[PDB]
Amino acid sequence: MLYHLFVNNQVKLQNDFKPESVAAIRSSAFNSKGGTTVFNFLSAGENILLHISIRPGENVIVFNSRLKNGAWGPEERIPYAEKFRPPNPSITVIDHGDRFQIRFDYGTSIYYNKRIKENAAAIAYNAENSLFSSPVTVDVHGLLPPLPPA
Amino acid sequence: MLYHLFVNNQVKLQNDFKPESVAAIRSSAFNSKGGTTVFNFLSAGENILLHISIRPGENVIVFNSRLKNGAWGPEERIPYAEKFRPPNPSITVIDHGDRFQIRFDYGTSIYYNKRIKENAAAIAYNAENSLFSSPVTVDVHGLLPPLPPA
Amino acid sequence: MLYHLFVNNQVKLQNDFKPESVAAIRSSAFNSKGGTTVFNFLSAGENILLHISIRPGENVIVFNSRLKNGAWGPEERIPYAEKFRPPNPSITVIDHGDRFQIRFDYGTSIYYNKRIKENAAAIAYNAENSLFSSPVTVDVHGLLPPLPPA
Amino acid sequence: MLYHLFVNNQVKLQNDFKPESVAAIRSSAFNSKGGTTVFNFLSAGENILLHISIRPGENVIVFNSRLKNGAWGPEERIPYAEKFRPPNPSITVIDHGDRFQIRFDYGTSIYYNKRIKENAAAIAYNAENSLFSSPVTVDVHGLLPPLPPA
């Protein structure tokens, strides 16, 4: 399913993002002078199951989770540099049941253990000066689709 | 190369759309009550190499070409019905040297012989009440990419 | 549909190879010291609709057609050099109704006007010392499948 | 990279199968009356990193590991039923660092924690009366390739 996720907005998924689900987020640009850029996978109750905070200024990408009216938990990090490939940077999130796999354009995948056992119903995108285009292209699959030879 | 083509606007191509090139246009939605929706492949001099005019009101899809300061040439029509697949209808245009191949979601491919021998430097999208989303996701290839088993 | 086409043998297609059909033939190797290698798309009546003769010794790739008990017609050619990419060379054939599009790994596509208006029921592979592996992987589609970003 | 893995034989990988790697194994057929069919991912020292034992007779699929000159470790079983889709059943193995992801044609992915920390240098295929074709088409990726919209 194709969605157009606009900055400081969200998209309601036709189906729950759950184990086996894949979200292929692609940007039509890379604004090298952009600031903190966030992608959140939300549950129906608006609990932030997966928070992805790309912070060029801090040269790090933070992953976290929190209930709608709860406190952020400990942050998990990975360096920002050499993760995105301009001019079409991307983020791919896959639900593996007990954890999330997040792949950017370079480097190895990041694995984040689920903290809030609930499926996602929407995906949000926030930024005051996004590193990416608005909107970003998002193809969501219920399962890994067939793969081309390369 | 991924581009986001907004309605009543256009995108300048990083490279010339020429033989072997492929443009996969995908809409995040289908607006059943939409009106005439157009897609133009323009050369650097603004000549309309390929005019795709979807007319639900006339229940037809029209193809044509014309120079920047010239009149339209003869029209080529095909049925509008049974072409687009909601909620993510699509259009795929391939340059085969002497002609363009246009594929929709249903039916056999449509072939339009080239009338203006120039490569396209841009793609335009116009509509007062677009049948499709704005923007539309557009992936342009320099050549057919590797194919998945399905 | 996936098939394993062995050298000096053939595969009977589950469905007729016809307009919109795509055959993605891939080899698991490139034997640089191989000789003339042939791929034929046959009709039920065993008429050779498309004959693809790769001749390294003559540095050319010949395309032709002939009825089961008929004579070969005029040959159409294209240089052999810089067409295949080792170690996994490929050939992609697409039926466009009035002609065939044949793409290798490099260079522009080759277009061959149909001479025998009939659909194909089988694909044959012949060679005494094939440039390719035995068998070759062959995925046949009833129509162009969705395309990955690249 | 495309390989053709013949039954009761193996293929040496051009590169190490390691984290991020993906092996898409596809059979050109399904032999309903076939017997126990095995796929092994072996390290350079011939240690069996991942043993995939499909047992229709026991109606189960077994996963295990062992050193070249060692005994088998504890077995992990899953149902055989509702896994493979004829006529072209498939198996997809992805290396996620600390574990392997194994996907068949139906059902959710199976995860097998790594037991031997070595990368695989080869893939073996054994069976007296294989459930699958011989050879099997195998596409090995160094990382997840771009995904088609479907």
Interface contact B57, partner D, CB < 8 A? no
| Sign of the four-CA dihedral D91, D95, D101, D106 | negative
In chain D, residues with a C-beta closer than 8 Å to the C-beta of A106 are none
C75 is in an annotated binding site: yes
- Bridge partners for A139 per DSSP: A2, A24
Rounded Cα gap, residues C3 and C16, in angstroms: 14
Give the CB-side neighbour count of residue B25, counting CA atoms within 13 A: 26
Give the residue numbers of the binding site of A for a carbohydrate.
51, 55, 64, 75, 77
Whether residue B46 contacts residue B147, with contact meaning beta carbons closer than 8 Å, is answered with no
Interface contact B141, partner D, CB < 8 A? no
Q: Where are the beta strands (DSSP E) in A6-117?
A: 9-17, 22-26, 37-42, 48-55, 60-66, 76-79, 90-95, 99-103, 110-113
Whether residue A110 contacts residue A101, with contact meaning beta carbons closer than 8 Å, is answered with yes
Rounded Cα gap, residues C20 and C22, in angstroms: 7
Kindly tell me the burial class for residue C129, based on how many C-beta atoms sit within 10 Å of its own C-beta (0-12, 13-18, 19 or more): exposed
Experimental technique of record:
X-ray
Rounded Cα gap, residues B46 and B48, in angstroms: 6
Backbone angles phi, psi at C57, to 5 degrees: -60, -30
Cis peptide leading into A56, omega within 30 of 0? no
In chain B, residues with a C-beta closer than 8 Å to the C-beta of D149 are 26, 88
Cis peptide leading into A135, omega within 30 of 0? yes
Backbone angles phi, psi at B61, to 5 degrees: -120, 125
**In terms of DSSP bridges, do strands C136-141 and C120-127 run parallel, antiparallel, or are they unpaired?**
unpaired
Smallest CA-to-CA distance from C83 within C64, C62, C101, C108 is with C108
DSSP symbols for D23-92: EEEE-S-B-TT---EEEEEE-TT--EEEEEEEETTTTEEEEEEE-TTS-----EEEE-SS---TTS-EEE
Left (φ > 0), alpha (ψ -120 to 50) or beta: where does C59 sit?
left
Say how many CB pairs under 8 Å bridge A and B: 42
Whether residue B24 contacts residue C147, with contact meaning beta carbons closer than 8 Å, is answered with yes
Q: At what resolution in Å was this solved?
A: 2.2
* Direct distance between the N- and C-terminal alpha carbons of chain C, in angstroms, rounded to an integer: 22
How far away is chain C from the Cα of B138, in angstroms, using its nearest Cα?
A: 9
Angle at A86 between CA A81 and CA A89, to 5 degrees: 80
In chain C, residues with a C-beta closer than 8 Å to the C-beta of B150 are 141, 145
Instruction: Give the helix, strand, coil percentages of chain A, each rounded to 5.
Output: 0, 50, 50
Q: Say which DSSP state B105 is in.
A: S
Cβ partners under 8 Å of residue B71, min gap 6: none
- Bridge partners for C75 per DSSP: none
Smallest CA-to-CA distance from D149 within B90, B104, A121 is with B90
C51 is in an annotated binding site: yes
Interface contact D96, partner A, CB < 8 A? yes
Query: What separation in angstroms does the CA of D9 have from each of B46, D12, D22, D121, D124?
Result: 60, 10, 20, 14, 6
**Cα maximum dimension of chain B:** 46
Name which CATH class applies to A1-150.
mainly beta
CB atoms D88 and C1 under 8 Å: yes
How far away is chain C from the Cα of B80, in angstroms, using its nearest Cα?
A: 19
Rounded Cα gap, residues D52 and C111, in angstroms: 45
In chain D, residues with a C-beta closer than 8 Å to the C-beta of C147 are 148-149
Rounded Cα gap, residues C132 and C90, in angstroms: 9
Interface contact B24, partner C, CB < 8 A? yes
Kindly tell me the burial class for residue A126, based on how many C-beta atoms sit within 10 Å of its own C-beta (0-12, 13-18, 19 or more): middle
Rounded Cα gap, residues C5 and C14, in angstroms: 14
Rounded Cα gap, residues D67 and C65, in angstroms: 56
Rounded Cα gap, residues D138 and D135, in angstroms: 9
Instruction: Chain A: list its partners (3+ Cβ pairs within 8 Å).
Output: B, C, D
Interface contact C142, partner D, CB < 8 A? no
Residue A50 burial (CB count, 10 A): 23
Where exactly are the structural domains of chain A? 1-150
In chain A, residues with a C-beta closer than 8 Å to the C-beta of B88 are 1-2
Smallest CA-to-CA distance from B11 within B3, B2, B21, B19 is with B3
Smallest CA-to-CA distance from D48 within D148, D126, D129 is with D126
Smallest CA-to-CA distance from A66 within A42, A86, A44 is with A42
Length of chain D: 150
Rounded Cα gap, residues A86 and B125, in angstroms: 25
